[PDB]
Design a protein around this ligand. Structure first.
Ligand SMILES: C[C@@H](O[C@@H]1[C@@H](N)[C@H](O)O[C@H](CO)[C@H]1O)C(=O)O
Ligand SMILES: C[C@@H](O[C@@H]1[C@@H](N)[C@H](O)O[C@H](CO)[C@H]1O)C(=O)O
Ligand SMILES: [Ca+2]
Ligand SMILES: [Ca+2]
Ligand SMILES: [Mn+2]
Ligand SMILES: [Mn+2]
Lengths: 180, 47, 180, 47
């Protein structure tokens, strides 16, 4: 049996158990992935690898993560691109920016990507996003095209709490966002 | 106001045995500040 | 608040959340630091840095670790050198082998070491070890000469259960080793 | 049922950096023994 757990209630300026990529850094006790500035990507990874399954036994792990995040736009109409929680290979590195959320490089399914992400997508990219143009939560596996989506109305500058849990026995991934 | 989504995602088919987890956020021609205020994670793998 | 937790009940061959140094590797469910071979050093580190105290608020962490380990020697007379659990800078690298146990270089106090270790020492090195010549448990800070030691009788080949706890309100470090 | 306990006051903040790595080491020299760890659990909390 293996377990990994951690919590960070407040982020400090030297948060050495995280790996920062792009412009992500910690400031005013927050993890800042992007400032309100054009064309940037920020990522932050937990420094320890996690053993999500074992080939020798076939066992798969359960996990739960909860986090509070905020998106702050100028106004609630010109807001982009969104945010992701992702699971990727140990050596992951930023992929395309903009509507690919730094995590995918095609709308086409790519088995070499090996990453699944829960996105909170704030901008409609006609080419792969829900046709109704709404902002939405989606589960992405190897592509920026979600396997499923749920519309969400962004409360600009509000703190949002999310819980994501994976249950290995039923293979179910549940995502919950709440604005309190 | 809560929003819940659930799906079956047989993780063993898509990701390696060892993975790293984290967050990503981007901007393009339009933009927004993206920030995380706290984070808790727990995983367990029987063996 | 910041928490780090993990457990590894059974190590397996690709233990990626461990950094191996020297000749340490994982085999047949075990973390092997040394085989029963002359002149070797093996170390293994958890991969994530842990925040043990904070300069901005002056708070230091509470922690507890427990592990079981085995020392298997040809016989009970010719046994050496020992085993350590240590705390050290993020960039720590193996120091001297033999009686220095891979973590220190001298019996002289060196504040530049920044390493505290609890040692389980099986060989009497006359230059710094307790002159009664007994195998012993010791707490080492910045030197291989322990600030305090307790005599321990090795049960060769048997598993030993260790708990090491640090209480930050009193700054007391407690070590206990139990054989069944 | 055979135990050995050692207690000491060690003001960690004076000796160790704020961010540390933790782990195990073992060595042999002219004499030797196998040193192996079978399980490990760790928990820390910084208020
Ligand atoms: C992914 C797509 O990204 C879009 C980007 N090109 C555009 O400039 O700005 C919008 C909104 O910020 C992005 O969604 C691309 O071109 O790579
Ligand atoms: C470092 C010190 O270590 C000792 C080693 N060199 C000695 O000869 O063999 C014993 C038993 O293994 C060690 O304690 C030294 O002599 O160099
Ligand atoms: Ca989009
Ligand atoms: Ca010794
Ligand atoms: Mn989308
Ligand atoms: Mn000693």
């Amino acid at each position: 049996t293996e377990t990994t757990s951690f919590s960070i209630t407040k982020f400090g300026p030297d948060q050495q158990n995280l790996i920062f990529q792009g412009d992500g850094y910690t400031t005013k006790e927050r993890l800042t992935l992007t400032k309100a500035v054009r064309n940037t990507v920020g990522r932050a990874l937990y420094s320890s690898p996690i053993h999500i399954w074992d080939s020798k036994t076939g066992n798969v792990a359960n996990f739960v993560t909860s986090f509070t995040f905020v998106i702050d736009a100028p106004n609630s109409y010109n807001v982009a691109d969104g945010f992701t929680f992702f699971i990727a290979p140990v050596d992951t590195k930023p992929q395309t920016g903009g509507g690919y959320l730094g995590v995918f490089n095609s709308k086409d399914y790519d088995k070499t990507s090996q990453t699944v992400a829960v996105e909170f997508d704030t901008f409609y990219n006609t080419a792969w996003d829900p046709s109704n143009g709404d902002r939405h939560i989606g589960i992405d596996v190897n592509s920026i095209k979600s396997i499923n989506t749920k519309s969400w109305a962004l409360q600009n500058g509000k703190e949002a709490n999310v819980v994501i849990a994976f249950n290995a026995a039923t293979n179910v991934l549940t995502v919950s966002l709440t604005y309190p | 106001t809560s929003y819940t989504l659930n799906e079956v995602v047989p993780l063993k088919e898509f990701v390696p045995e060892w993975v790293r987890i984290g967050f990503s956020a981007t901007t393009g021609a339009e933009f927004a500040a993206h920030e995380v205020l706290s984070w808790y994670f727990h995983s367990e793998l029987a063996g």
